[PDB]
Design a protein around this nucleic acid. Structure first.
Length: 67
RNA sequence: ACGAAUCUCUUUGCCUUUUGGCUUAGAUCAAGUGUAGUAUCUGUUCUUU
């Protein structure tokens, strides 16, 4: 929590040193994604989907769909 | 032919849906995309009129 806080403040001051301990999932480390180790994977892309429909005024009105 | 009434048009008269403020003209004139919608395009074919 405290690290998050410091990082938050750091972001607030645009001084964020881009330094990570664990490297990202690139195409090479893709192999070592999984390794007899319990994992989970998350995507939030289709949480907020929208029906674009016209209005009386003529402009667009976005309405939420199930996601 | 004169008088009158009815109708149509033309000339004029009437403006009869006929401009309802002020400021520094009140101020400033852009660099966008994909996705969707909407309208508008244009072609495109065929049908029968």
């Amino acid at each position: 929590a405290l690290y998050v806080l410091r990082e938050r403040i750091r972001k607030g001051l645009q001084i964020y040193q881009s330094s990570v301990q664990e490297p990202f999932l690139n195409s090479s480390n893709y192999a070592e994604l999984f390794n007899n180790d319990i994992k989970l994977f998350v995507d939030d892309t289709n949480v907020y989907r929208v029906t674009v429909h016209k209005t009386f005024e003529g402009n667009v009105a976005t309405k939420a769909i199930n996601g």
